[PDB]
Amino acid sequence: XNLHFCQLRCKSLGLLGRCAXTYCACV
Amino acid sequence: VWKEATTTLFCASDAKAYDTEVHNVWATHACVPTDPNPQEVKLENVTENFNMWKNNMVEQMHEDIISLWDQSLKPCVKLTGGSVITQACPKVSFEPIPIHYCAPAGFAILKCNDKKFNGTGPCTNVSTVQCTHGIRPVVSTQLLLNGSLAEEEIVIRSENFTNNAKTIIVQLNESVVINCTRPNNDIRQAHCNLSKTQWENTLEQIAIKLKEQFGNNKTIIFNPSSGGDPEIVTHSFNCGGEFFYCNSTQLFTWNDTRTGRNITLPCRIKQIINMWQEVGKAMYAPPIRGQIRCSSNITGLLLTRDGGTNGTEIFRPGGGDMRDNWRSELYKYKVVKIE
Amino acid sequence: VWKEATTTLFCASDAKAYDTEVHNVWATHACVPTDPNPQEVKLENVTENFNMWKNNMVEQMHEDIISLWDQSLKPCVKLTGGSVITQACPKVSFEPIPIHYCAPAGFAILKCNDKKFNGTGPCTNVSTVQCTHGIRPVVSTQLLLNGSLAEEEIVIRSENFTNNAKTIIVQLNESVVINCTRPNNDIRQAHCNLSKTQWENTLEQIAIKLKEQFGNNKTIIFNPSSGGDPEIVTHSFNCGGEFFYCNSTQLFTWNDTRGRNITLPCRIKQIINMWQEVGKAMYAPPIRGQIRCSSNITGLLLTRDGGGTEIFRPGGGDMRDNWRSELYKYKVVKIE
Ligand SMILES: *[C@@H]1O[C@H](CO)[C@@H](O)[C@H](O)[C@H]1NC(C)=O
Ligand SMILES: *[C@@H]1O[C@H](CO)[C@@H](O)[C@H](O)[C@H]1NC(C)=O
Ligand SMILES: *[C@@H]1O[C@H](CO)[C@@H](O)[C@H](O)[C@H]1NC(C)=O
Ligand SMILES: *[C@@H]1O[C@H](CO)[C@@H](O)[C@H](O)[C@H]1NC(C)=O
Ligand SMILES: *[C@@H]1O[C@H](CO)[C@@H](O)[C@H](O)[C@H]1NC(C)=O
Ligand SMILES: *[C@@H]1O[C@H](CO)[C@@H](O)[C@H](O)[C@H]1NC(C)=O
Ligand SMILES: *[C@@H]1O[C@H](CO)[C@@H](O)[C@H](O)[C@H]1NC(C)=O
Ligand SMILES: *[C@@H]1O[C@H](CO)[C@@H](O)[C@H](O)[C@H]1NC(C)=O
Ligand SMILES: *[C@@H]1O[C@H](CO)[C@@H](O)[C@H](O)[C@H]1NC(C)=O
Ligand SMILES: *[C@@H]1O[C@H](CO)[C@@H](O)[C@H](O)[C@H]1NC(C)=O
Ligand SMILES: *[C@@H]1O[C@H](CO)[C@@H](O)[C@H](O)[C@H]1NC(C)=O
Ligand SMILES: *[C@@H]1O[C@H](CO)[C@@H](O)[C@H](O)[C@H]1NC(C)=O
Ligand SMILES: *[C@@H]1O[C@H](CO)[C@@H](O)[C@H](O)[C@H]1NC(C)=O
Ligand SMILES: *[C@@H]1O[C@H](CO)[C@@H](O)[C@H](O)[C@H]1NC(C)=O
Ligand SMILES: *[C@@H]1O[C@H](CO)[C@@H](O)[C@H](O)[C@H]1NC(C)=O
Ligand SMILES: *[C@@H]1O[C@H](CO)[C@@H](O)[C@H](O)[C@H]1NC(C)=O
Ligand SMILES: *[C@@H]1O[C@H](CO)[C@@H](O)[C@H](O)[C@H]1NC(C)=O
Ligand SMILES: *[C@@H]1O[C@H](CO)[C@@H](O)[C@H](O)[C@H]1NC(C)=O
Known part of the structure; x- marks a missing residue:
């Protein structure tokens, strides 16, 4: 992956979000 | 030259019908017995390009292990796309076994035997195998x-x-x-x-x-x-x-x-x-x-x-992407159509 | 180094709202006016790899021309997957116009100006453009x-x-x-x-x-x-x-x-x-x-x-190669 929610959550961490397969990875 | 091609790869394994462990059960129905007569043939004077990052063998293994898990490890509740399914969720015996991938008639598996082969580009020591080596489908x-x-x-x-x-x-x-x-x-x-x-x-x-x-x-x-x-x-x-x-x-x-x-x-x-x-x-x-x-x-x-910098x-x-897990073992292989 | 990236490209054209021709009608809603102030900037001492065979600009253009046709040229009867649709199918005026593709904020279009560039590998004469040249979307x-x-x-x-x-x-x-x-x-x-x-x-x-x-x-x-x-x-x-x-x-x-x-x-x-x-x-x-x-x-x-x-x-047959024949010198990168 849910890329937007991933971007949502990682943004909150002050990072970009990207899919790692079906998982969310922060960058 | 013989061209890379997508085909119906089949799996082989030493799975036992009497072993209720879930890889064994899956392989009993989905796979044949490990090749009793393996044959690796060196292709003399052949240079072949490989590309481990675009290898349909990886996608095929991925779908197989998805199917193995989906059949084997049932969750009590599953949420996808806002929709909920619930079902019986028995505990199972789980220990991966080696699975081999084999090419059917009309196709060959090429293997790169160059030492420290980086995964892409020309391989100068190429052989054909009937099946890959045995790969444990570890998800991690x-x-x-x-x-x-x-x-x-x-x-x-x-x-x-x-x-x-x-x-x-x-x-x-x-x-x-x-x-x-x-x-x-x-x-x-x-x-x-x-x-x-x-x-x-x-x-x-x-x-x-x-x-x-x-x-x-x-x-x-x-x-x-x-x-x-x-x-x-x-x-x-x-x-x-x-x-x-x-x-x-x-x-x-x-x-x-x-310390x-x-x-x-x-x-x-x-x-x-x-x-x-x-x-x-x-x-x-x-x-x-x-x-x-x-x-x-x-x-x-x-x-x-x-x-x-700096x-x-x-x-x-x-x-995360389990394709890279499969790739870590399949990197030396590709499938080609014999033409 | 700016990395290749997929984004929301927009189109620009000299389409006229008073022209009933179907590319004009489509572009009037879908595109902005042709860039009134184009700017090509030579990127000195830059070498950039291109790959015309894997260029999302091509996929984007393909989707746009599919939409142009789908909205514009209505068949009386259509058969896809055993299912039939029928609808009004008036004759139309049809003459392609040049469409430019432009990168929105945060992205740049890189252009390869090397002569006899084969479409892949390193380009040593690279510029940025706000939009591509005008491409007539001829389906043939x-x-x-x-x-x-x-x-x-x-x-x-x-x-x-x-x-x-x-x-x-x-x-x-x-x-x-x-x-x-x-x-x-x-x-x-x-x-x-x-x-x-x-x-x-x-x-x-x-x-x-x-x-x-x-x-x-x-x-x-x-x-x-x-x-x-x-x-x-x-x-x-x-x-x-x-x-x-x-x-x-x-x-x-x-x-x-x-x-x-x-x-x-x-x-x-x-x-x-x-x-x-x-x-x-x-x-x-x-x-x-x-x-x-x-x-x-x-x-x-x-x-x-x-x-x-x-x-x-x-x-x-695959019209993506048609688009590619014009888009081969371009790629989109994210400015980072
Ligand atoms: C992982 O371990 C470290 C200690 O080495 C700790 O600081 C951290 O909180 C741990 N992570 C989580 C999610 O608890
Ligand atoms: C190229 O031409 C030479 C001269 O006729 C010929 O001997 C050779 O086999 C040709 N090579 C190929 C790959 O066709
Ligand atoms: C080009 O295609 C030939 C024939 O399929 C193949 O043997 C070769 O590996 C390809 N070259 C590259 C660089 O992929
Ligand atoms: C080619 O690879 C095979 C398999 O590892 C090896 O046995 C053989 O010695 C290699 N040949 C050369 C010339 O390195
Ligand atoms: C692994 O490679 C290193 C080279 O850094 C070598 O010294 C070592 O002996 C190798 N491992 C074994 C088990 O030989
Ligand atoms: C793999 O090795 C070749 C040389 O044979 C090289 O051109 C290529 O860049 C290497 N792959 C990567 C990902 O660097
Ligand atoms: C782990 O490595 C040892 C040798 O260090 C080997 O004997 C054993 O079979 C390996 N186990 C698996 C599951 O690969
Ligand atoms: C690795 O292999 C050993 C031997 O089969 C097994 O006991 C262990 O559970 C395996 N690890 C994983 C993560 O599958
Ligand atoms: C270097 O590593 C040590 C211990 O491994 C750690 O205490 C220290 O903070 C690290 N500092 C830097 C600059 O890497
Ligand atoms: C892991 O277990 C083996 C026996 O199963 C033992 O020989 C080894 O020392 C253990 N290693 C650690 C780090 O506990
Ligand atoms: C490798 O990635 C970098 C960074 O995106 C890019 O500039 C370069 O062109 C890439 N190399 C190839 C061969 O695609
Ligand atoms: C094509 O049409 C142009 C004028 O529209 C004319 O000058 C030219 O000779 C024509 N060519 C042929 C092959 O008929
Ligand atoms: C680079 O390409 C541009 C655009 O065609 C051209 O005007 C310029 O002369 C070229 N530069 C060199 C050094 O060839
Ligand atoms: C087309 O290319 C040929 C061969 O290089 C050249 O002789 C001719 O002048 C070119 N024509 C134009 C209009 O550039
Ligand atoms: C095109 O040019 C590049 C770089 O000069 C080269 O690597 C490639 O093999 C050439 N042929 C192609 C891409 O078909
Ligand atoms: C066709 O080429 C001529 C130059 O020979 C040019 O004047 C004309 O605008 C071109 N037509 C189109 C539709 O691009
Ligand atoms: C090519 O361009 C000319 C000028 O706009 C136009 O008359 C002709 O119909 C175009 N051909 C096609 C196939 O679109
Ligand atoms: C195309 O024209 C040729 C004559 O040049 C003729 O033999 C052939 O039948 C034609 N094709 C069709 C589909 O009519």
């Missing part, structure tokens, strides 16, 4: 377990090293054993032990190979995951049918300039997991009782490098 | 029409020349005009005329370039299509809203040993295999009057048979 993040070691030295491979978005697949040439246990008699508390000196030596040797790639003037740093789903922030894997999430901070905090004999990783067994098969979440039942223990060879790693490169544990 | 097979010419000499490009499955995109450096007419007052009978000497000269020059690629010891032969759907067996295109299927045997029967116009017999068809998606569509019979298009042949799509002789045949 960060560390690759129970795989095949490099023959002469550590090798690192990437689709594009200069692109910080591309995963780096590390192939070790010496295994590091890791023992993970949820003790007999907090039922979700577990841990992993591995040799401190062996792991440190391993990081040191990977760092040398990263320096070879990125520049002698670089200083190499390992740091933990920057965050995301717990599946990729931790070293996650299945042991005995239970989902272990092991804190790997100690494994991935390192610099070149420097205890063993590294102990704290782990938790989780019931609610983000699925690797497809985007969604699943809930399994609480852990079985008794000692739950797995002893594994760490044979590789998945790493990412922080993008960019003289330092930072690497973190990655993974 | 075999011949590429009304495109951009190579600057210095004919160029041939392939994702892999040694792989006979890969299409060869030929970029001419001199256009050959082709005039196709369904005469005023058999309403489906049509023809195309073009200069025989110009076409023969063109084949001779392509053959030289193919020999450069495949070997001086090779003899180059052109032969007609080996068969398949009529759309790819013939040179097919839309002129004035009508679907023309032109017999191109005379264009593609050639070896290096040997009237003034070549005349290609054509037919206007109502039942077509769709290029947008797998299926078939039926349109209404031809409008009355002269239906005529005069086009510059600026490129070709070829296939090679494979197996001292190399045989080339007219190809095409």
Whole structure:
């Protein structure tokens, strides 16, 4: 992956979000 | 010349019909017996291009292991696309077995035997095999377990090293054993032990190979995951049918300039997991009782490098896309149509 | 280093709101006005890898032209996946206009200005542009029409020349005009005329370039299509809203040993295999009057048979290669 929610959550961490397969990875 | 082609690969294994372990059960219906008469033929004076990053064998294995898990490990609740399914969710016996992939009539599997082959480009020592070697379909993040070691030295491979978005697949040439246990008699508390000196030596040797790639003037740093789903922030894997999430901070905090004999990783067994098969979440039942223990060879790693100056490169544990796990074993193979 | 990236490209054109022609109507809603203040900036001392065969700009353009056609040219009956739809199918005015593709904020279009750039690998003369040049979205097979010419000499490009499955995109450096007419007052009978000497000269020059690629010891032969759907067996295109299927045997029967116009017999068809998606569509019979298009042949799509002789045949079918024939010098990157 849910890329937007991933971007949502990682943004909150002050990072970009990207899919790692079906998982969310922060960058 | 014979051209790369997608076909219907079939699997072979030493699965036993009398073994209720779930890989065995799946393979009993989906696979044939391991090749009783393997034949590797050297193709003299043949140079063949390979591309481990675009290999349909990987996609085929991925679909097979998805099917194995989907048939084998049923969650009590599964949430996908806002829709909920609930079902019976028995505990199972779970221990991966080696699976071979074989080409049917009209197709051949080419194998690259060049030493320290980087995964792409020309291979000068090519053979044909009827089936791949036996690959344990281990689903995990960060560390690759129970795989095949490099023959002469550590090798690192990437689709594009200069692109910080591309995963780096590390192939070790010496295994590091890791023992993970949820003790007999907090039922979700577990841990992993591995040799401190062996792991440190391993990081040191990977760092040398990263320096070879990125520049002698670089200083190499390992740091933990920057965050995301717990599946990729931790070293996650299945042991005995239970989902272990092991804190790997100690494994991935390192610099070149420097007690205890063993590294102990704290782990938790989780019931609610983000699925690797497809985007969604699943809930399994609480852990079985008794000692739950797995002893594994760490044979590789998945790493990412922080993008960019200034003289330092930072690497973190990655993974997530299980295709890279399959790729770590399938990188020397491709399928071609005999024409 | 700016990395290649997929984003929301927008289009720009000189479309007019008072023009009922269907590209104009589509562009009036979908596109902005042509950049009134274009800016090309040379990126000094930059070398950038391009890969025309994996360029999301092509996929984006494809989706846009599918939408343009889907909104604009309505068949009376459409069959996809065993399901039939029927609807009003009025005749329309149809004449492609140039469409530019532009990068939104945070992204840049890189352009490769190296001469005889083969489409992949490093480019040493790179600039940024706000938008691409204006590309007429001509849907056709075999011949590429009304495109951009190579600057210095004919160029041939392939994702892999040694792989006979890969299409060869030929970029001419001199256009050959082709005039196709369904005469005023058999309403489906049509023809195309073009200069025989110009076409023969063109084949001779392509053959030289193919020999450069495949070997001086090779003899180059052109032969007609080996068969398949009529759309790819013939040179097919839309002129004035009508679907023309032109017999191109005379264009593609050639070896290096040997009237003034070549005349290609054509037919206007109502039942077509769709290029947008797998299926078939039926349109209404031809409008009355002269239906005529005069086009510059600026490129070709070829296939090679494979197996001292190399045989080339007219190809095409996947319109992404049409877009690629114009987009090959561009890529989109994220500014970071
Ligand atoms: C080619 O690879 C095979 C398999 O590893 C090996 O036995 C053989 O010696 C190699 N040949 C050469 C010339 O290196
Ligand atoms: C782990 O490595 C040892 C050798 O160090 C080997 O004997 C054993 O079979 C390996 N186990 C697996 C599961 O690959
Ligand atoms: C692994 O490669 C290293 C090279 O750094 C070599 O010294 C070592 O002996 C290899 N492993 C084994 C088990 O030989
Ligand atoms: C793999 O090795 C070839 C040389 O044979 C090299 O051109 C290529 O860049 C290497 N792959 C990567 C990802 O660097
Ligand atoms: C590798 O990635 C970098 C960064 O995106 C890019 O500039 C370069 O062109 C890539 N190399 C290839 C061969 O695609
Ligand atoms: C792992 O277990 C094996 C026996 O199964 C033992 O020999 C080894 O010392 C253990 N390693 C650690 C780090 O506990
Ligand atoms: C992982 O372990 C470190 C201690 O090394 C700790 O700071 C961190 O909070 C742990 N992670 C989680 C998610 O508890
Ligand atoms: C280097 O590593 C040591 C221990 O491994 C750590 O205490 C220290 O903070 C690190 N500093 C740098 C600059 O890497
Ligand atoms: C690795 O292989 C050993 C031997 O089969 C097994 O006991 C262990 O559970 C495996 N590890 C994983 C993570 O599958
Ligand atoms: C680079 O390409 C541009 C655009 O065609 C051209 O004007 C310029 O002269 C070229 N530069 C060199 C050094 O060839
Ligand atoms: C095109 O040019 C590049 C760089 O000069 C080269 O690597 C490639 O093999 C050439 N042919 C192609 C891409 O078909
Ligand atoms: C065709 O080429 C001529 C130059 O020979 C040019 O003037 C004309 O504008 C071109 N037509 C199209 C539709 O691009
Ligand atoms: C086309 O290319 C040929 C061969 O390089 C050259 O002789 C001719 O002048 C070119 N024509 C134009 C209009 O550029
Ligand atoms: C080009 O295609 C041929 C024929 O399929 C193949 O053997 C070769 O590996 C391809 N080249 C590249 C660079 O992929
Ligand atoms: C094509 O039409 C133009 C005018 O529209 C004319 O000058 C030219 O001779 C025609 N060519 C042929 C081959 O009929
Ligand atoms: C190229 O031409 C020479 C000379 O006729 C011939 O002997 C050779 O076999 C040819 N090579 C190929 C690959 O066709
Ligand atoms: C195309 O024209 C040739 C004559 O040049 C003829 O033999 C062939 O039948 C024609 N094709 C069709 C489909 O009519
Ligand atoms: C090519 O461009 C000319 C000028 O706009 C136009 O009359 C002709 O119909 C075009 N050809 C096609 C096939 O769109």
